[PDB]
Amino acid sequence: TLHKERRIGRLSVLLLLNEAEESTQVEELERDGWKVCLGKVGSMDAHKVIAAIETASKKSGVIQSEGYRESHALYHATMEALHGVTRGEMLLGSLLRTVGLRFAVLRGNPYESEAEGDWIAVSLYGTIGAPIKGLEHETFGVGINHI
Amino acid sequence: TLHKERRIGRLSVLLLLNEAEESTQVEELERDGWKVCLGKVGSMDAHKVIAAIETASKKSGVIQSEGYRESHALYHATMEALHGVTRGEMLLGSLLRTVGLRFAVLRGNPYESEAEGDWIAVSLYGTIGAPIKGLEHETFGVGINHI
Amino acid sequence: TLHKERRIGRLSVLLLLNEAEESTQVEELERDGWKVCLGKVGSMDAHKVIAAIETASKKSGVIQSEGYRESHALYHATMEALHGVTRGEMLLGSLLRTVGLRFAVLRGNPYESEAEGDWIAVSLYGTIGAPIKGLEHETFGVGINHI
Amino acid sequence: TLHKERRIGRLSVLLLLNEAEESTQVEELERDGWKVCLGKVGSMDAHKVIAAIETASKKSGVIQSEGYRESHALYHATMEALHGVTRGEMLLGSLLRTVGLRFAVLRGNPYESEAEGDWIAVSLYGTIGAPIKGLEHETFGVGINHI
Amino acid sequence: TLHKERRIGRLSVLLLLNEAEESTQVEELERDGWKVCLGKVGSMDAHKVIAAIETASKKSGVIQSEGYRESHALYHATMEALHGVTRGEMLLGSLLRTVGLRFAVLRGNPYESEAEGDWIAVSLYGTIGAPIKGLEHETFGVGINHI
Amino acid sequence: TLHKERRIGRLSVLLLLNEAEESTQVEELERDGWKVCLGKVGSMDAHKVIAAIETASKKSGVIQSEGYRESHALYHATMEALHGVTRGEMLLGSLLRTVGLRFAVLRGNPYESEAEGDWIAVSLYGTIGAPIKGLEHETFGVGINHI
Numbered sequence: 001t002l003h004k005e006r007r008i009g010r011l012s013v014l015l016l017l018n019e020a021e022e023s024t025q026v027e028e029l030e031r032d033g034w035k036v037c038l039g040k041v042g043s044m045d046a047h048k049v050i051a052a053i054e055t056a057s058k059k060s061g062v063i064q065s066e067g068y069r070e071s072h073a074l075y076h077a078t079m080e081a082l083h084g085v086t087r088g089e090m091l092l093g094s095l096l097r098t099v100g101l102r103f104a105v106l107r108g109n110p111y112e113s114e115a116e117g118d119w120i121a122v123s124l125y126g127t128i129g130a131p132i133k134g135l136e137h138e139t140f141g142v143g144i145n146h147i
Numbered sequence: 148t149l150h151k152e153r154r155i156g157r158l159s160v161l162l163l164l165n166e167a168e169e170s171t172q173v174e175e176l177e178r179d180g181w182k183v184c185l186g187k188v189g190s191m192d193a194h195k196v197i198a199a200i201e202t203a204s205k206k207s208g209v210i211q212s213e214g215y216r217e218s219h220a221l222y223h224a225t226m227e228a229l230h231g232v233t234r235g236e237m238l239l240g241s242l243l244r245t246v247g248l249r250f251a252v253l254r255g256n257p258y259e260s261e262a263e264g265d266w267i268a269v270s271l272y273g274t275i276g277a278p279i280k281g282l283e284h285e286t287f288g289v290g291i292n293h294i
Numbered sequence: 295t296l297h298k299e300r301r302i303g304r305l306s307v308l309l310l311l312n313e314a315e316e317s318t319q320v321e322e323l324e325r326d327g328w329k330v331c332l333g334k335v336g337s338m339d340a341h342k343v344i345a346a347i348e349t350a351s352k353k354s355g356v357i358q359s360e361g362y363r364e365s366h367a368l369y370h371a372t373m374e375a376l377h378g379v380t381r382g383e384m385l386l387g388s389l390l391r392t393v394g395l396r397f398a399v400l401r402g403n404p405y406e407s408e409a410e411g412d413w414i415a416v417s418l419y420g421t422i423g424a425p426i427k428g429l430e431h432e433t434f435g436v437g438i439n440h441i
Numbered sequence: 442t443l444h445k446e447r448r449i450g451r452l453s454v455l456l457l458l459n460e461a462e463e464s465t466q467v468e469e470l471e472r473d474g475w476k477v478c479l480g481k482v483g484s485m486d487a488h489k490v491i492a493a494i495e496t497a498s499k500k501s502g503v504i505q506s507e508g509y510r511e512s513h514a515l516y517h518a519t520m521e522a523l524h525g526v527t528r529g530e531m532l533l534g535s536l537l538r539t540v541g542l543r544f545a546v547l548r549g550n551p552y553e554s555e556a557e558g559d560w561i562a563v564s565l566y567g568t569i570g571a572p573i574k575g576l577e578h579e580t581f582g583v584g585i586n587h588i
Numbered sequence: 589t590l591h592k593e594r595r596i597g598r599l600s601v602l603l604l605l606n607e608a609e610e611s612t613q614v615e616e617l618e619r620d621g622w623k624v625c626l627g628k629v630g631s632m633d634a635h636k637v638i639a640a641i642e643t644a645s646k647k648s649g650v651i652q653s654e655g656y657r658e659s660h661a662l663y664h665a666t667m668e669a670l671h672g673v674t675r676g677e678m679l680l681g682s683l684l685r686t687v688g689l690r691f692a693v694l695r696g697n698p699y700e701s702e703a704e705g706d707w708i709a710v711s712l713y714g715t716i717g718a719p720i721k722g723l724e725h726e727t728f729g730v731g732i733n734h735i
Numbered sequence: 736t737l738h739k740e741r742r743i744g745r746l747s748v749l750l751l752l753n754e755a756e757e758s759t760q761v762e763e764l765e766r767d768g769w770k771v772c773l774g775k776v777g778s779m780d781a782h783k784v785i786a787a788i789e790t791a792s793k794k795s796g797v798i799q800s801e802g803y804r805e806s807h808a809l810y811h812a813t814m815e816a817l818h819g820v821t822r823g824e825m826l827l828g829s830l831l832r833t834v835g836l837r838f839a840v841l842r843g844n845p846y847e848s849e850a851e852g853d854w855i856a857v858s859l860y861g862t863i864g865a866p867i868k869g870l871e872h873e874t875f876g877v878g879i880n881h882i
């Protein structure tokens with residue numbers, strides 16, 4: 001049973017969609033026990049987007065830089081988040097489209113039971129469109145996995 | 148070029164991730180020129196989710212009840228939103244899973260140029276999991292289409 | 295190398311798209327060695343479409359009624375054709391859509407080399423849309439396989 | 442309700458499949474109000490196919506060169522057409538296959554109701570096969586969208 | 589780094605494909621620390637296949653019957669295993685096909701490092717074909733996930 | 736009806752999951768009427784995997800080098816096998832992952848009836864993971880097609 005005050009997806013997105021400067025949200029989340037990561041990436045290569053999120057997450061300590069288990073968890077969460085962004089074909093450049101994304105990676109236990117352990121949410125928000133500036137619309141994606 | 152203050156996708160999600168009995172968000176969006184629709188639907192059948200959204204959108208005036216054009220725009224936007232929710236296979240019950248969703252449909256021009264016309268954003272947020280309460284996690288979906 | 299005058303795909307589609315009350319196009323195709331099957335099926339169930347095509351193909355003798363080999367070839371060609379019709383998710387009713395289709399199944403050798411043997415083409419044309427009539431547009435699909 | 446004499450999909454495919462050295466089928470379509478674009482592209486890169494179609498459609502005036510709305514409509518119709526050609530994975534060269542395509546893009550209102558406005562159809566026909574010539578079969582795809 | 593003597597996928601499959609009677613393999617695996625589950629399921633409903641594997645796994649203690657975390661791990665492994673079986677469309681009956689499967693669920697650490705924790709492999713083997721006995725060919729699928 | 740002692744899929748996997756320097760499995764299979772091919776390939780490009788299999792199959796005599804028919808059968812069998820390996824998106828490098836595979840291709844009649852002709856099974860087994868050694872898990876894929 002998800003804890004209303006700990007809905008990892010909702011929190012990662014509210015953080016991702018907030019454009020305030022005086023921004024205590026990251027601090028607030030961390031104070032509540034969440035591991036947080038924020039970044040940006042623009043590319044016509046999906047592998048670069050995956051690479052950016054992975055690197056940023058490991059450098060911020062959201063997931064372990066050693067071992068495979070957590071990288072595996074993150075990879076599949078990223079893949080799922082990319083589904084909402086690509087909608088059908090997980091291809092960007094090869095389908096003549098590119099993305100300008102902001103991404104948030106949030107790690108923690110979103111349930112009332114401590115036995116559920118840590119879960120990770122990968123949220124993406126930005127634009128997807130032609131290689132030409134302006135010709136685009138928004139894109140969104142949230143992937144959640146146990147970790 | 149997307150108008151910074153009229154990012155329909157971002158606005159539709161934020162509207163959905165809001166939990167203030169007295170937000171006045173809907174009215175505020177309507178006063179800014181947006182046609183807004185909110186609803187909820189729980190089911191193991193994707194077709195019931197699609198139908199709820201279409202019914203709510205037509206009843207609220209978000210899209211014309213007559214003609215195919217707007218219904219077509221909404222259907223595809225709904226399909227794109229379902230991609231983020233289903234991530235790979237647009238199936239619920241047949242894959243032994245179910246959803247509990249809140250949905251928002253916004254309709255207006257998110258671009259700086261009036262020539263871009265109206266666009267529609269279907270946003271979904273809730274849970275997806277086994278038919279058993281508690282065994283589930285969050286799910287998001289955002290589809291954007293022109294009208 | 296495809297024989298210019300034996301393009302099984304093109305031929306099956308021309309037959310499918312041309313309303314010839316007279317001048318049996320089927321007779322001409324058969325006179326040239328092609329085995330031909332034509333039919334129509336309307337449904338919100340893809341399995342009924344697949345079934346209609348199989349039954350009609352076997353009844354007309356386009357594929358053997360006994361054995362698996364030929365049914366296997368036909369099934370896959372049918373699946374490939376359905377991809378053009380469904381465009382992403384091979385689902386109809388579960389996604390609140392229905393099809394009204396006319397289908398053609400052609401069998402013969404479309405290559406200059408006789409050693410290539412028989413191939414089969416399954417072609418579909420009609421409409422796909424909401425259950426309510428009027429809300430729909432055209433749909434097409436062609437699947438080709440060796441047999 | 443689709444106008445029997447204005448089936449944009451069927452018309453785009455007939456144009457595509459019929460080799461008319463004389464009697465300009467294009468002139469007749471244009472005389473009836475349709476905006477038409479024809480072209481050919483051979484490649485192992487789907488983005489070049491998409492690009493060829495967009496450039497040709499804009500050059501011929503089938504869709505506006507400025508703005509995003511119409512390019513958006515065309516892009517999605519192109520994607521839908523590619524589904525019939527690729528049947529599962531919208532990949533060409535990365536899966537060791539290449540296409541030789543002829544394409545047609547038609548724009549007009551295919552419905553009895555003038556209120557429906559313009560719709561667009563992207564149709565593709567040609568071959569798909571191994572890089573080595575001779576090893577290939579036909580491929581088709583039709584995408585329809587409102588614009 | 590995978591441990592050659594502990595390759596969870598390979599082991600689950602060798603167990604699944606072994607048709608011996610005097611069968612000490614399950615005992616051998618369990619003696620080595622693996623949690624093992626074996627079953628059979630024939631159906632035209634993918635949800636029944638997923639249901640069978642889940643139930644069998646929980647009744648055999650391969651995964652916890654309480655909580656969501658492990659059910660989540662198993663569900664996604666099952667989904668991945670089903671990809672090899674369905675190859676493109678995770679649909680059975682709706683696409684007029686059915687399966688007769690044997691399944692093995694193996695849980696344990698396949699790496700040299702103990703820090704990798706438990707992983708789960710879901711292996712499927714049997715036939716997939718028409719609803720008629722005989723008209724079918726073999727099908728295989730292996731899904732691996734951390735747990 | 737599949738011949739219990741000639742289950743091509745099962746035989747191809749078992750052949751691949753074997754690690755005896757002196758198994759004599761290949762010769763034993765060839766003496767039972769099967770055409771056999773074994774190979775290995777590591778890459779971040781699916782097209783290189785497809786090419787290795789095709790090259791190995793033609794060089795070993797598993798399929799004819801001339802004509803398209805057998806190449807077509809093999810290509811689709813290879814594609815079906817890749818589904819189990821890629822599970823959803825038939826992409827490797829573009830999704831920042833790579834494979835280290837062993838493959839086996841068997842060709843013969845697995846049915847009790849000689850009228851079913853020859854069929855081909857492409858089996859894949861190895862690892863899929865990040866471009867970094869150690870960060871990966873097992874992957875399987877089996878594709879079956881008629882010739």
Ligand SMILES: N[C@@H](Cc1c[nH]c[nH+]1)C(=O)O
Binds near residue numbers: 136
């Ligand atoms: N609109 C496309 C992106 C795009 C490509 N070219 C123009 N727009 C999408 O939904 O992904």
Ligand SMILES: N[C@@H](Cc1c[nH]c[nH+]1)C(=O)O
Binds near residue numbers: 275284663
């Ligand atoms: N977790 C699954 C849903 C589910 C089914 N059973 C348990 N969970 C998903 O990502 O859709």
Ligand SMILES: N[C@@H](Cc1c[nH]c[nH+]1)C(=O)O
Binds near residue numbers: 218223392422424429
């Ligand atoms: N537009 C949908 C069909 C549809 C469903 N509802 C309305 N139209 C398609 O492209 O398949």
Ligand SMILES: N[C@@H](Cc1c[nH]c[nH+]1)C(=O)O
Binds near residue numbers: 570
């Ligand atoms: N047969 C493949 C094309 C191909 C690749 N190599 C040989 N043929 C298809 O259906 O797309």
Ligand SMILES: N[C@@H](Cc1c[nH]c[nH+]1)C(=O)O
Binds near residue numbers: 718
């Ligand atoms: N051969 C089909 C199954 C089938 C359905 N009907 C006959 N066979 C497959 O590859 O899944």
Ligand SMILES: N[C@@H](Cc1c[nH]c[nH+]1)C(=O)O
Binds near residue numbers: 071075
């Ligand atoms: N685990 C991924 C592969 C991978 C990429 N990076 C790490 N692992 C899969 O299931 O394909």
Ligand SMILES: [Mg+2]
Binds near residue numbers: 144664
């Ligand atoms: Mg999940």
Ligand SMILES: [Mg+2]
Binds near residue numbers: 223431585
């Ligand atoms: Mg449509």
Ligand SMILES: [Mg+2]
Binds near residue numbers: 725879
């Ligand atoms: Mg098959």
Ligand SMILES: [Mg+2]
Binds near residue numbers: 137291513517
């Ligand atoms: Mg778009």
Ligand SMILES: [Mg+2]
Binds near residue numbers: 732
């Ligand atoms: Mg994995």
Ligand SMILES: [Mg+2]
Binds near residue numbers: 438578
């Ligand atoms: Mg083919």
